[model samples]
Target chain A: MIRDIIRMGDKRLLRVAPQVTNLGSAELHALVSDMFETMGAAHGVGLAAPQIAVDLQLMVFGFEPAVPLTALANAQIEPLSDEMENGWEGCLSIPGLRAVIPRYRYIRYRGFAPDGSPIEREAEGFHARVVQHEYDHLVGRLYPSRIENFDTFGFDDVLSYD
Target chain B: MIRDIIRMGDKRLLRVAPQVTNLGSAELHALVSDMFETMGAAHGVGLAAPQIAVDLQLMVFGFEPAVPLTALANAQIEPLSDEMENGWEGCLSIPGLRAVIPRYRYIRYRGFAPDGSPIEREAEGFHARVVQHEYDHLVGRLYPSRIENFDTFGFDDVLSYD
Candidate 1:
């Protein structure tokens, strides 16, 4: 079932998501499935628990079918490189808007899977961008807050970069 | 100007890409622009010279507003980790289909920008996937050829994972 994605102004989207301590539960599995379904329905690359009015530290993201639906619980990111890059970003909650946000060029993220198994990996480029974006949701921060330049922010349709 | 993406059966897709010696030439800029346009029009994340029937070793990729359009010439990838992961992949040349492809979880790629300036970075996740896929095109390879399990391969519509 595709759950409603809470909008930018919603209070739930502003609160910090609590850590997901309970893993491997039916409820957790169901939530993960619904998150994937919701993100897929919206053609989004990522979604966080806070986006759906849930306060648990969990997120799911992928580029498309080629990228598998990956779930992260209690995710944490560590910058691997001082180098940063600026690129455009859009969120499902903030529909019809896009902005060029700067993010670390490389990062190492560690989290637990739905099964409570430890997961750790380093990433760069769009992968690092996606992870950092979703991780921000857990901290109650939106992409707009990270925007350094408003010149690149505008309606998604108006943006030329597909 | 968008160029026609040559299909798999085309011999151009099989030949190894020649080095782009003219790093900052008008022809290089035009080709890069055309590749970006073609990839955008086709809703693809990556494109290589071979895919567009060009012989030079060049490629471009990005994930919509989140990942800006990036172009690289004479690109080369070096694995940063021994860990490998599997993810589904679809190509512009092979439309309406996807398959689970195995790739290095982390990589560092070095190449020249369209302007002939040097560009280098490390990446993981989808970013690494895109780079590897496009780099393979430069070497006469496709995602399907990297498929280790056909069970995970099928028509894009028939496959459920988004």
Candidate 2:
């Protein structure tokens, strides 16, 4: 099931997904694998169910403190702080674009593992971003919608990104 | 420089990154390589500059029909349809989970390559979703925020996901 990612403006990206009642379904396991596989093909840090066109609250992410890539499902976020910061960003939908956006300085995410076990973690920085990125799909929104200032958005071609 | 992914709850994740004005900088190229390296370590599909705490408008992504992964900077999206579909999801932050969500059926992504070249692509299905997922970071949102019903979300544990 190695496939590509869903792009922007396809309407599907705007649709909201229903919660998955079946956390133990094999369909999800294989699909999640394919999702990150799909993700790996693109060298992505994250992937959502919707990216593959599946209406689930799941996110596959990577390059953790651990040896393996990562994924999350039915997850919820709790900002660990009132602080907020901005950082670089991009999308597979728009391929080679980059931008800067604000996010919670820290967060507590709760959900289940693909093994059907409840999972929770207080991850900060990039992990939060990746999880949150994939999490966006479940709620039907793209990063562009949250841009406070469009000035930061642009192509990577000659922007001299650092 | 294959570093690890930033974990959830890092304040850096919540910050708004400054746009990378120099997409052609060696800093970007070096960083992009490390970003991809970090992603490849955990088998990631994408990595944003912010993931590494770089306040620049740049990102690195991969896992495509092509062998090498892809990267972009200062990109944008152009929706190509009115259709939506659902699929599975996960995250590297929490590292292990699954869910279902909806996304666009097709889209056209435009941006710059790590090497400072304009890049544009029209993709559908999973491609759109993957694109959209990464794009979320640029704007400061997560996949969980898009969830309409909690019932549809769950972990990958024994989910028998396909």
Candidate 3:
């Protein structure tokens, strides 16, 4: 169920994704599964609904197998610390490139799962970065838009680290 | 040189790493470069001297090439806040497994670079996590030793999210 991932230039990738009003619908569940499959197939850390051409506020992300695929619907983030950290990030839509983006060091996010269950948690590090990145997509933003310095941005092929 | 990685249960991995007395020595620079090469080959976020059977108090880590490979000698970390966050972690020394490890949300680490220059920076998210994980190896500890819940630990094959 790996759906097509809309590229960065797609008009769908530029508009704010609509909120999920029917969280527990079968369509929502199927979309969640498809998003996870699509993200995994691309070897991406996270994916937003807009990236898959779905106009819904949804995202999934995690780096390890034991770290279960997290699906968020109509997600909202609250900063837990005023401090920020800069880290390089790549997106499935932008492929083959990465840039250093500064993000809140800690955050608490609340949203609904595909089954309409309330989900909330506090996160930091890569987890926080992923959530913020995907959340930005829901609001019509890409990682590159948040880059403060062009000197730190470049194609992945020239980069030594992954 | 890609040195032999000292596996878990090895006496070398359990012993405290000795401080690096000659920060800018040619030998230190070679070792640092070698560590970076080995870590990249293993696709690891961080690696410590003990993990490579070296007793020096040194480590290197970064998520991407643009982030730059950071080498720390005689590193010391201070928590910037009491807040903590849990994230999954895996080590090259203990390959094929991952565990949920809790770490400080923000930290400031002070150390010397391989060039004998003073290095100090505050980090949050994955950067902080990598520093803490590698720093633990310097003190004779592994991620498993700090894991408090076994339910979240498992072999990589069983975990599906990564």
Candidate 4:
């Protein structure tokens, strides 16, 4: 039940995904399942609903053998500190491209699970980055625009850590 | 320099506007002038950039003849009080539709002027409502979404105060 995803340059990718008002519904369950499937199939770290052309504030992330990919609906994030970090980031929609993206080092995200239960936690490192990255899609943003230096922007295969 | 505005239900109205990185430019000057002309013609108390299909964190407001309309770029708002008030609200996009909208009674907004000057102000009453109303558009929110009760929503001509 994998859904088709829109890539970079699609006008729809640049829109603020609306909040999901129907929580813990059958449709939400099914949609999240499809999202997880599509995300896994593409080997993406995370996926936002808007990435699949569904204008809803739902996101699935957490895979990578470290954390299980989880789903959140109507997620809201608040930066916990002024500390900033430059992390290498990629988007499922923007294939083969990666950038050193600027992001908050820590964040507090409070949202709900697909089951309508609450999901609130503080995250740092890769966890925080993925949450921020995926949420960016919900707010009509891409990682590329967040790149502060062009020297750090390049193809995934050619990007240098230095 | 009056520009046409996209009305409600237009998909453009639902997208998160991007931040304005360029301040005090001739382009920003021309744009805000056009926005002012358009808003004044419509007799609107405020105007958001997205209304004219320009997706940027910019807005112009304050033309009740009592207060001259001013402009702001990359405006950020924080509620200063938890107190809420229900006020009759209207939008230029939705035209004649008016509704009782709940809003924070006071707020502080920080941004920049069209000339690249910094802007920081505290507002309440009509000014607060106008700032909150216009800022909502930048984040893809419409006044209708803030309506606590649908019984108070209707066309301006037929809406009853009671």
Backbone clash numbers for all candidates listed: 5, 160, 6, 0
Residues A28-116, candidate 3, lDDT per residue (tens digit)?
A: 88888999899989999889999888898999988661345799899999999899999999878766666688999899999998898
Residue by residue across B1-162, what tens digits does model 3's lDDT show? 777776654556767888999987998999999999898888888889999989989999886513457999999999999999999998787665666889998999999999999999989977888899999999887776666654454446544332
Give the alpha carbon lDDT tens digit for every residue of A1-162 in model 4: 998877664657777887898897999999999999999899888999999999999999986527556899989999999999988897777665666778999999999999889999889878999999999899887775576654454456544456
Which pairs clash in model 3? A64-B162, A65-B159, A65-B161, A65-B162, A125-B125, A125-B126
Return the lDDT, model 1, position B92: 76
Error of 1 at A138 (Å): 48
- For the second chain, the TM-scores of the candidates in order are 0.95, 0.85, 0.95, 0.96
Better of 2 and 3 by lDDT: 3
Q: What lDDT tens digits, residue by residue, belong to model 2 across residues B1-162?
A: 977565433445445666666677897788888888887888767666666656666667768644246787876778899898887755554244445667787899898886678889887776677777667666654465555433444334423423
Q: Which parts of model 3 are misplaced by more than 4 Å? A: A1-162, B65-67, B160-162
- Share of the reference A-B contacts seen in candidate 2: 0.00
Q: After superposition, how far is residue B68 of candidate 1 from its true place, in Å?
A: 3.7
Tens digit per residue, CA lDDT, model 4, B26-120: 99899999998999899898999999999999999986415456899999999999999889998887665667888999999999998889999
Model 4: TM-score, first chain: 0.96
Q: What lDDT does model 2 reach?
A: 0.69
lDDT of 1 by residue, A29-75 (tens): 99999999999899999999998899999999986515456899989
Which lDDT values do the candidates have, in the order given?
Answer: 0.82, 0.69, 0.81, 0.83
Clashing pairs in model 1, backbone N/Cα/C closer than 3 A:
A66-B88, A66-B89, A88-B65, A88-B66, A124-B124
